[PDB]
Design an enzyme around this catalytic site. Structure first.
Site, PDB file in Angstrom:
ATOM      1  NE  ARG A  38      -3.900   2.122   2.320  1.00 47.22           N
ATOM      2  CZ  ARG A  38      -4.299   2.831   3.370  1.00 47.22           C
ATOM      3  NH1 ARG A  38      -3.712   2.656   4.547  1.00 47.22           N
ATOM      4  NH2 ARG A  38      -5.281   3.714   3.247  1.00 47.22           N
ATOM      5  CG  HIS A  42      -1.187   5.451  -0.230  1.00 45.99           C
ATOM      6  ND1 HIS A  42      -1.696   5.778   1.008  1.00 45.99           N
ATOM      7  CD2 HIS A  42      -2.159   4.756  -0.865  1.00 45.99           C
ATOM      8  CE1 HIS A  42      -2.924   5.305   1.115  1.00 45.99           C
ATOM      9  NE2 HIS A  42      -3.228   4.680  -0.009  1.00 45.99           N
ATOM     10  CB  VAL A  46       1.247  11.524  -4.257  1.00 45.59           C
ATOM     11  CG1 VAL A  46       1.343  13.017  -3.945  1.00 45.59           C
ATOM     12  CG2 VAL A  46      -0.049  10.946  -3.684  1.00 45.59           C
ATOM     13  N   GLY A  48       4.072  10.503  -8.766  1.00 50.65           N
ATOM     14  CA  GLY A  48       4.801   9.345  -9.249  1.00 50.65           C
ATOM     15  C   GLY A  48       5.545   8.637  -8.136  1.00 50.65           C
ATOM     16  CB  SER A  52       6.941  12.317  -2.632  1.00 49.53           C
ATOM     17  OG  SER A  52       5.733  11.652  -2.970  1.00 49.53           O
ATOM     18  CD  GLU A  64       3.433  12.651  -0.609  1.00 50.76           C
ATOM     19  OE1 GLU A  64       3.033  11.480  -0.782  1.00 50.76           O
ATOM     20  OE2 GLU A  64       4.266  13.201  -1.357  1.00 50.76           O
ATOM     21  CG  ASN A  70      -0.688   8.589   3.234  1.00 53.02           C
ATOM     22  OD1 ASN A  70      -0.727   7.416   2.866  1.00 53.02           O
ATOM     23  ND2 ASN A  70      -0.281   9.574   2.445  1.00 53.02           N
ATOM     24  CG  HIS A 170      -8.451  -3.832  -1.345  1.00 47.93           C
ATOM     25  ND1 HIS A 170      -9.402  -2.936  -1.781  1.00 47.93           N
ATOM     26  CD2 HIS A 170      -7.415  -3.089  -0.888  1.00 47.93           C
ATOM     27  CE1 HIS A 170      -8.959  -1.702  -1.600  1.00 47.93           C
ATOM     28  NE2 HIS A 170      -7.754  -1.768  -1.060  1.00 47.93           N
ATOM     29  CB  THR A 171      -6.116 -10.690  -2.470  1.00 45.78           C
ATOM     30  OG1 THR A 171      -6.379 -12.085  -2.258  1.00 45.78           O
ATOM     31  CG2 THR A 171      -4.615 -10.454  -2.441  1.00 45.78           C
ATOM     32  CB  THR A 225      -7.010 -16.504   1.568  1.00 41.82           C
ATOM     33  OG1 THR A 225      -7.104 -15.728   0.365  1.00 41.82           O
ATOM     34  CG2 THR A 225      -7.509 -17.914   1.298  1.00 41.82           C
ATOM     35  CG  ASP A 230      -5.801 -15.976  -2.514  1.00 38.37           C
ATOM     36  OD1 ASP A 230      -6.354 -14.867  -2.350  1.00 38.37           O
ATOM     37  OD2 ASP A 230      -5.936 -16.929  -1.714  1.00 38.37           O
TER      38      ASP A 230
END
Ligand code: HEM
Ligand SMILES: [Ca+2]
Ligand SMILES: [Ca+2]
Length: 306
Positions: A38, A42, A46, A48, A52, A64, A70, A170-171, A225, A230
Protein backbone atom coordinates in the site's frame (compact mmCIF):
# COMPACT_ATOMS: atom_id res chain seq x y z
CA UNK A 1 13.74 4.36 -19.34
CA UNK A 2 13.47 2.09 -16.29
CA UNK A 3 15.04 -1.38 -16.50
CA UNK A 4 14.95 -4.48 -14.25
CA UNK A 5 18.75 -4.83 -14.39
CA UNK A 6 19.57 -1.33 -13.11
CA UNK A 7 21.34 -2.65 -9.99
CA UNK A 8 22.72 -5.94 -11.31
CA UNK A 9 26.25 -4.48 -11.15
CA UNK A 10 26.06 -1.82 -8.43
CA UNK A 11 23.96 -3.79 -5.92
CA UNK A 12 23.19 -7.34 -7.12
CA UNK A 13 21.91 -8.39 -3.68
CA UNK A 14 19.42 -5.57 -3.14
CA UNK A 15 16.31 -7.71 -3.73
CA UNK A 16 17.65 -10.39 -1.39
CA UNK A 17 18.30 -7.85 1.37
CA UNK A 18 14.80 -6.44 0.96
CA UNK A 19 13.28 -9.92 1.07
CA UNK A 20 15.19 -10.88 4.23
CA UNK A 21 13.95 -7.75 5.99
CA UNK A 22 10.31 -8.50 5.18
CA UNK A 23 10.61 -12.20 6.08
CA UNK A 24 11.93 -11.24 9.52
CA UNK A 25 9.30 -8.55 10.10
CA UNK A 26 6.48 -10.88 9.06
CA UNK A 27 7.17 -13.08 12.08
CA UNK A 28 6.11 -10.32 14.47
CA UNK A 29 3.76 -8.45 12.14
CA UNK A 30 1.82 -10.63 9.63
CA UNK A 31 0.24 -7.47 8.20
CA UNK A 32 3.50 -5.86 7.03
CA UNK A 33 3.45 -7.29 3.48
CA UNK A 34 0.04 -5.72 2.83
CA UNK A 35 1.14 -2.46 4.46
CA UNK A 36 4.24 -2.18 2.28
CA UNK A 37 2.36 -2.81 -0.96
CA UNK A 38 0.00 0.00 0.00
CA UNK A 39 2.87 2.39 0.72
CA UNK A 40 4.14 1.90 -2.84
CA UNK A 41 0.63 2.51 -4.20
CA UNK A 42 0.38 5.74 -2.19
CA UNK A 43 3.83 6.77 -3.36
CA UNK A 44 3.05 6.29 -7.04
CA UNK A 45 -0.33 8.06 -6.99
CA UNK A 46 1.29 11.30 -5.79
CA UNK A 47 3.82 12.85 -8.19
CA UNK A 48 4.80 9.35 -9.25
CA UNK A 49 6.89 6.73 -7.48
CA UNK A 50 9.53 9.12 -6.12
CA UNK A 51 9.52 8.16 -2.43
CA UNK A 52 7.81 11.48 -1.68
CA UNK A 53 5.55 9.71 0.82
CA UNK A 54 8.54 8.70 2.94
CA UNK A 55 9.57 12.29 3.72
CA UNK A 56 8.81 13.71 7.18
CA UNK A 57 7.72 17.27 8.02
CA UNK A 58 9.97 20.30 7.46
CA UNK A 59 9.22 23.97 8.05
CA UNK A 60 8.88 24.52 4.29
CA UNK A 61 6.62 21.59 3.30
CA UNK A 62 4.13 19.30 5.04
CA UNK A 63 4.46 15.52 5.04
CA UNK A 64 2.10 13.36 2.99
CA UNK A 65 1.81 11.25 6.13
CA UNK A 66 -0.85 13.71 7.33
CA UNK A 67 -3.02 13.27 4.23
CA UNK A 68 -6.54 11.94 4.74
CA UNK A 69 -5.56 8.67 3.07
CA UNK A 70 -2.36 8.26 5.11
CA UNK A 71 -2.96 9.65 8.60
CA UNK A 72 -3.66 6.96 11.20
CA UNK A 73 -3.68 4.47 8.33
CA UNK A 74 -0.42 4.15 6.38
CA UNK A 75 2.19 2.08 8.23
CA UNK A 76 5.50 0.25 7.95
CA UNK A 77 7.78 3.29 7.72
CA UNK A 78 10.30 1.97 10.28
CA UNK A 79 10.58 -1.30 8.34
CA UNK A 80 11.50 0.67 5.22
CA UNK A 81 14.14 2.50 7.27
CA UNK A 82 15.56 -0.84 8.36
CA UNK A 83 15.96 -2.27 4.87
CA UNK A 84 17.31 1.05 3.59
CA UNK A 85 20.02 1.00 6.26
CA UNK A 86 20.89 -2.60 5.37
CA UNK A 87 21.08 -1.78 1.67
CA UNK A 88 23.17 1.33 2.38
CA UNK A 89 25.60 -0.90 4.27
CA UNK A 90 25.82 -3.39 1.41
CA UNK A 91 25.90 -0.74 -1.32
CA UNK A 92 26.51 2.86 -0.11
CA UNK A 93 24.62 5.68 -1.85
CA UNK A 94 23.35 3.40 -4.63
CA UNK A 95 19.70 2.38 -4.29
CA UNK A 96 17.08 5.14 -4.21
CA UNK A 97 14.25 5.01 -1.68
CA UNK A 98 11.80 5.09 -4.60
CA UNK A 99 13.29 1.90 -6.06
CA UNK A 100 13.68 0.33 -2.61
CA UNK A 101 9.96 0.77 -1.96
CA UNK A 102 9.09 -0.64 -5.39
CA UNK A 103 11.18 -3.76 -4.76
CA UNK A 104 9.69 -4.03 -1.26
CA UNK A 105 6.18 -4.00 -2.72
CA UNK A 106 6.97 -6.75 -5.24
CA UNK A 107 8.75 -8.90 -2.65
CA UNK A 108 5.82 -8.42 -0.27
CA UNK A 109 3.38 -9.67 -2.90
CA UNK A 110 5.59 -12.69 -3.64
CA UNK A 111 6.12 -13.55 0.03
CA UNK A 112 2.34 -13.52 0.54
CA UNK A 113 2.01 -16.13 -2.20
CA UNK A 114 1.58 -13.86 -5.20
CA UNK A 115 3.47 -13.77 -8.52
CA UNK A 116 7.22 -13.29 -8.73
CA UNK A 117 8.78 -10.86 -11.20
CA UNK A 118 11.63 -8.35 -11.55
CA UNK A 119 10.38 -4.77 -11.34
CA UNK A 120 11.77 -2.03 -13.60
CA UNK A 121 14.34 0.08 -11.74
CA UNK A 122 16.20 3.37 -12.03
CA UNK A 123 13.84 5.72 -10.19
CA UNK A 124 15.24 8.58 -8.14
CA UNK A 125 14.06 10.39 -5.00
CA UNK A 126 11.98 13.56 -4.78
CA UNK A 127 13.29 16.80 -3.29
CA UNK A 128 9.96 17.58 -1.63
CA UNK A 129 6.67 16.06 -0.40
CA UNK A 130 3.17 16.81 -1.70
CA UNK A 131 0.46 16.84 0.98
CA UNK A 132 -2.17 18.71 -1.03
CA UNK A 133 -1.59 16.48 -4.03
CA UNK A 134 -1.97 13.39 -1.82
CA UNK A 135 -5.31 14.68 -0.51
CA UNK A 136 -6.46 15.28 -4.07
CA UNK A 137 -5.10 12.15 -5.74
CA UNK A 138 -5.66 9.26 -3.32
CA UNK A 139 -9.05 7.62 -3.93
CA UNK A 140 -11.55 7.01 -1.13
CA UNK A 141 -13.63 3.91 -0.28
CA UNK A 142 -16.85 5.86 -0.84
CA UNK A 143 -15.96 6.74 -4.44
CA UNK A 144 -18.40 5.67 -7.16
CA UNK A 145 -17.02 3.62 -10.05
CA UNK A 146 -16.84 6.71 -12.28
CA UNK A 147 -14.89 8.46 -9.51
CA UNK A 148 -12.53 5.50 -9.11
CA UNK A 149 -11.87 5.47 -12.85
CA UNK A 150 -11.30 9.24 -12.76
CA UNK A 151 -8.76 8.87 -9.94
CA UNK A 152 -6.73 6.27 -11.83
CA UNK A 153 -6.88 8.16 -15.12
CA UNK A 154 -5.75 11.31 -13.29
CA UNK A 155 -2.39 9.72 -12.47
CA UNK A 156 -1.91 8.04 -15.84
CA UNK A 157 -3.68 4.67 -15.62
CA UNK A 158 -6.41 4.76 -18.30
CA UNK A 159 -7.24 1.05 -18.43
CA UNK A 160 -10.06 -0.58 -16.54
CA UNK A 161 -7.74 -3.57 -16.22
CA UNK A 162 -5.38 -1.31 -14.24
CA UNK A 163 -8.19 -0.53 -11.81
CA UNK A 164 -9.62 -4.03 -11.51
CA UNK A 165 -6.23 -5.77 -11.25
CA UNK A 166 -4.66 -3.33 -8.79
CA UNK A 167 -7.80 -3.40 -6.61
CA UNK A 168 -6.75 -7.02 -6.14
CA UNK A 169 -4.35 -5.65 -3.56
CA UNK A 170 -7.33 -6.10 -1.25
CA UNK A 171 -6.84 -9.87 -1.38
CA UNK A 172 -5.10 -9.27 1.97
CA UNK A 173 -4.63 -6.57 4.59
CA UNK A 174 -6.87 -4.73 7.06
CA UNK A 175 -9.58 -2.05 6.92
CA UNK A 176 -11.03 0.06 9.74
CA UNK A 177 -14.72 -0.17 10.66
CA UNK A 178 -14.88 3.57 10.05
CA UNK A 179 -14.85 3.02 6.28
CA UNK A 180 -17.86 0.69 6.07
CA UNK A 181 -20.22 2.09 8.73
CA UNK A 182 -22.37 3.71 6.04
CA UNK A 183 -22.69 0.45 4.11
CA UNK A 184 -23.76 -1.32 7.28
CA UNK A 185 -26.33 1.10 8.73
CA UNK A 186 -27.08 4.14 6.58
CA UNK A 187 -25.93 4.05 2.98
CA UNK A 188 -26.32 7.20 0.90
CA UNK A 189 -28.69 8.68 3.50
CA UNK A 190 -31.29 5.90 3.23
CA UNK A 191 -31.04 4.69 6.81
CA UNK A 192 -30.59 1.29 5.18
CA UNK A 193 -27.56 -0.88 4.39
CA UNK A 194 -25.90 -0.93 0.96
CA UNK A 195 -28.10 -3.32 -1.10
CA UNK A 196 -25.02 -4.64 -2.91
CA UNK A 197 -23.63 -6.12 0.31
CA UNK A 198 -24.51 -9.79 0.78
CA UNK A 199 -27.04 -9.96 3.63
CA UNK A 200 -25.34 -12.86 5.43
CA UNK A 201 -22.00 -11.04 5.30
CA UNK A 202 -23.80 -7.86 6.39
CA UNK A 203 -24.66 -9.58 9.68
CA UNK A 204 -21.06 -10.68 10.21
CA UNK A 205 -19.71 -7.19 9.54
CA UNK A 206 -22.30 -5.58 11.81
CA UNK A 207 -21.07 -7.85 14.60
CA UNK A 208 -17.48 -6.75 14.03
CA UNK A 209 -18.46 -3.11 13.57
CA UNK A 210 -21.49 -2.30 15.77
CA UNK A 211 -23.06 1.14 15.52
CA UNK A 212 -21.37 3.57 17.92
CA UNK A 213 -18.57 1.05 18.39
CA UNK A 214 -14.80 1.28 17.95
CA UNK A 215 -14.39 2.88 14.51
CA UNK A 216 -10.68 2.02 14.50
CA UNK A 217 -11.31 -1.72 14.90
CA UNK A 218 -9.79 -3.67 12.00
CA UNK A 219 -11.46 -6.14 9.65
CA UNK A 220 -10.05 -8.33 6.87
CA UNK A 221 -10.42 -7.17 3.27
CA UNK A 222 -10.65 -10.78 2.09
CA UNK A 223 -12.87 -13.04 4.20
CA UNK A 224 -11.64 -16.13 2.34
CA UNK A 225 -7.85 -15.85 2.69
CA UNK A 226 -7.06 -12.75 4.86
CA UNK A 227 -3.27 -12.87 4.48
CA UNK A 228 -2.66 -14.82 1.28
CA UNK A 229 -2.18 -13.02 -2.03
CA UNK A 230 -4.51 -14.86 -4.39
CA UNK A 231 -7.57 -14.31 -6.59
CA UNK A 232 -10.13 -14.95 -3.83
CA UNK A 233 -10.80 -11.21 -3.71
CA UNK A 234 -12.69 -11.48 -7.01
CA UNK A 235 -14.66 -14.56 -6.00
CA UNK A 236 -15.94 -12.48 -3.06
CA UNK A 237 -17.11 -9.68 -5.37
CA UNK A 238 -19.12 -12.14 -7.47
CA UNK A 239 -21.01 -13.07 -4.29
CA UNK A 240 -21.46 -9.43 -3.23
CA UNK A 241 -18.86 -9.85 -0.50
CA UNK A 242 -16.46 -7.05 -1.37
CA UNK A 243 -15.64 -5.26 1.90
CA UNK A 244 -15.66 -1.59 0.91
CA UNK A 245 -17.91 0.27 -1.52
CA UNK A 246 -15.09 0.75 -4.03
CA UNK A 247 -14.49 -3.03 -4.08
CA UNK A 248 -18.07 -4.08 -4.74
CA UNK A 249 -18.67 -1.38 -7.34
CA UNK A 250 -16.23 -3.13 -9.68
CA UNK A 251 -18.91 -5.80 -10.04
CA UNK A 252 -22.19 -4.08 -9.13
CA UNK A 253 -21.98 -0.49 -10.41
CA UNK A 254 -24.34 0.61 -13.20
CA UNK A 255 -21.11 1.73 -14.89
CA UNK A 256 -19.44 -1.69 -14.53
CA UNK A 257 -20.12 -3.00 -18.04
CA UNK A 258 -16.37 -2.97 -18.68
CA UNK A 259 -15.17 -4.10 -15.24
CA UNK A 260 -17.54 -7.04 -14.66
CA UNK A 261 -15.92 -9.24 -17.34
CA UNK A 262 -12.50 -8.45 -15.85
CA UNK A 263 -13.65 -9.37 -12.34
CA UNK A 264 -15.02 -12.66 -13.68
CA UNK A 265 -11.86 -13.44 -15.66
CA UNK A 266 -9.68 -12.87 -12.60
CA UNK A 267 -11.98 -14.94 -10.39
CA UNK A 268 -11.97 -17.76 -12.94
CA UNK A 269 -8.19 -17.95 -13.37
CA UNK A 270 -5.32 -17.28 -10.97
CA UNK A 271 -2.93 -17.09 -13.93
CA UNK A 272 -5.08 -14.47 -15.65
CA UNK A 273 -5.18 -12.39 -12.46
CA UNK A 274 -1.49 -12.74 -11.64
CA UNK A 275 -0.48 -11.76 -15.18
CA UNK A 276 -2.75 -8.72 -15.09
CA UNK A 277 -1.53 -7.72 -11.63
CA UNK A 278 2.12 -7.75 -12.71
CA UNK A 279 1.27 -5.80 -15.86
CA UNK A 280 -0.72 -3.20 -13.91
CA UNK A 281 1.86 -3.02 -11.12
CA UNK A 282 4.63 -2.24 -13.59
CA UNK A 283 2.43 0.37 -15.26
CA UNK A 284 1.78 2.04 -11.89
CA UNK A 285 5.48 1.83 -11.08
CA UNK A 286 6.16 3.72 -14.31
CA UNK A 287 4.19 6.81 -13.31
CA UNK A 288 6.26 10.00 -13.75
CA UNK A 289 9.60 8.75 -12.39
CA UNK A 290 12.61 10.98 -11.83
CA UNK A 291 15.54 9.37 -13.67
CA UNK A 292 19.14 9.94 -14.71
CA UNK A 293 20.45 12.91 -12.73
CA UNK A 294 17.00 14.19 -11.71
CA UNK A 295 16.33 14.06 -7.99
CA UNK A 296 18.79 12.15 -5.82
CA UNK A 297 19.65 8.90 -4.06
CA UNK A 298 18.32 9.72 -0.60
CA UNK A 299 20.51 8.33 2.20
CA UNK A 300 17.81 8.62 4.88
CA UNK A 301 14.39 8.11 3.28
CA UNK A 302 12.83 10.57 5.74
CA UNK A 303 14.86 13.61 4.73
CA UNK A 304 16.35 15.22 1.62
CA UNK A 305 20.15 14.99 1.45
CA UNK A 306 22.08 18.00 2.75
C1 HEM B 1 -9.18 1.55 -6.10
C2 HEM B 1 -9.17 2.43 -4.96
C3 HEM B 1 -8.75 2.10 -3.68
C4 HEM B 1 -9.39 2.50 -2.55
C5 HEM B 1 -10.59 3.44 -2.45
C6 HEM B 1 -8.71 1.90 -1.44
C7 HEM B 1 -9.08 2.04 -0.10
C8 HEM B 1 -8.43 1.47 1.01
C9 HEM B 1 -8.83 1.67 2.39
C10 HEM B 1 -10.05 2.46 2.88
C11 HEM B 1 -7.98 0.95 3.15
C12 HEM B 1 -8.09 0.80 4.67
C13 HEM B 1 -7.18 1.79 5.39
C14 HEM B 1 -7.29 1.70 6.90
O1 HEM B 1 -8.18 0.98 7.40
O2 HEM B 1 -6.48 2.35 7.59
C15 HEM B 1 -7.03 0.32 2.25
C16 HEM B 1 -6.07 -0.62 2.62
C17 HEM B 1 -5.25 -1.35 1.76
N1 HEM B 1 -5.19 -1.13 0.39
FE1 HEM B 1 -6.49 -0.10 -0.75
N2 HEM B 1 -7.63 1.15 -1.86
C18 HEM B 1 -7.61 1.31 -3.24
C19 HEM B 1 -6.61 0.75 -4.06
C20 HEM B 1 -5.52 -0.03 -3.67
C21 HEM B 1 -4.42 -0.44 -4.53
C22 HEM B 1 -4.24 -0.01 -5.98
C23 HEM B 1 -3.56 -1.16 -3.75
C24 HEM B 1 -2.32 -1.73 -4.07
C25 HEM B 1 -2.00 -2.34 -5.33
C26 HEM B 1 -4.14 -1.18 -2.42
C27 HEM B 1 -3.66 -1.92 -1.34
C28 HEM B 1 -4.17 -1.94 -0.05
C29 HEM B 1 -3.70 -2.78 1.01
C30 HEM B 1 -2.70 -3.93 0.85
C31 HEM B 1 -4.34 -2.41 2.15
C32 HEM B 1 -4.09 -2.97 3.54
C33 HEM B 1 -2.96 -2.21 4.20
C34 HEM B 1 -2.69 -2.65 5.63
O3 HEM B 1 -3.36 -3.58 6.11
O4 HEM B 1 -1.80 -2.05 6.27
N3 HEM B 1 -5.31 -0.45 -2.37
N4 HEM B 1 -7.33 0.64 0.93
CA1 LIG C 1 5.16 9.96 -4.67
CA1 LIG D 1 -6.54 -13.48 -0.20
Amino acid sequence: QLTPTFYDNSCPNVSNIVRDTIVNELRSDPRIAASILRLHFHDCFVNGCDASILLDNTTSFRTEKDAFGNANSARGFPVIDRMKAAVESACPRTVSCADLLTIAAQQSVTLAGGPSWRVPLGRRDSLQAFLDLANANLPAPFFTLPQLKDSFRNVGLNRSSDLVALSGGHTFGKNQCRFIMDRLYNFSNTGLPDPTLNTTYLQTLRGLCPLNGNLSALVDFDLRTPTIFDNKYYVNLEEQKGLIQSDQELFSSPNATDTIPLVRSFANSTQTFFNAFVEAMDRMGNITPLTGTQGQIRLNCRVVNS
